[PDB]
Design a protein around this ligand. Structure first.
Ligand SMILES: CO[C@@H]1CC/C=C/c2cccc(c2)[C@@H](C)OC(=O)[C@@H]2CCCN(N2)C(=O)[C@H](C)NC(=O)[C@H](C(C)C)NC(=O)[C@@H]1C
Length: 164
């Protein structure tokens, strides 16, 4: 019953592939709903055309700034920020989808996908989903990151929406 959403990823115009995500609405319904709605654009704004602005190989890929496209922006469907819903789910391994933030209770639209177990983030970032299909695409995106996160090409959500 959990929603499934997809991103079609391109590297400066070159199609890379589709990543799909299960959103754990059963555990974090408010956080899952925000991501679902931003992925469909049904509130009038969202992730389509935004990039993965910070990519660190062996760690994670971060994106979701559709307001400024410079890594400082983003907003939720509830307002500029919303609470950390709960920390039941942990950063257990690759594929984990979690909220980026600037401190407690500052969730907006920015998110990241883990490419490794990142347990030191447990209790600080809200985990709310996981890659279902296309983990190979996320691994491919890593080659375009670097140790300090700066990307060598713009990794774009060319299209996105909801599958189930
Ligand atoms: C421009 O923004 C700045 C700087 C933020 C991060 C800088 C930075 C640079 C290099 C390496 C790393 C972080 C490594 C250690 O950590 C991550 O990659 C972590 C990994 C989990 C997701 N994530 N970034 C985050 O959630 C980070 C900390 N936060 C942000 O990106 C927020 C966004 C959501 C407004 N920005 C802010 O708090 C500021 C206004």
């Amino acid at each position: 019953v959990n929603p499934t959403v997809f991103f079609d990823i391109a590297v400066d115009g070159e199609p890379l592939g589709r990543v799909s995500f299960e959103l754990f609405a059963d555990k974090v319904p408010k956080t899952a709903e925000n991501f679902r709605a931003l992925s469909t654009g049904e509130k009038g704004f969202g992730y389509k055309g935004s990039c993965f602005h910070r990519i660190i190989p062996g760690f994670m890929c971060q994106g979701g700034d559709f307001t400024r496209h410079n890594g400082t922006g983003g907003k939720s469907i509830y307002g500029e920020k919303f609470e950390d819903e709960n920390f039941i789910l942990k950063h257990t391994g690759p594929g984990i989808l979690s909220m980026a933030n600037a401190g407690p209770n500052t969730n907006g639209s920015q998110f990241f996908i883990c490419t490794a177990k990142t347990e030191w983030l447990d209790g600080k970032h809200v985990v709310f989903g996981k890659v279902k299909e296309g983990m190979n695409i996320v691994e491919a995106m890593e080659r375009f990151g670097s140790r300090n996160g700066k990307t060598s090409k713009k990794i774009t959500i060319a299209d996105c929406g909801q599958l189930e």
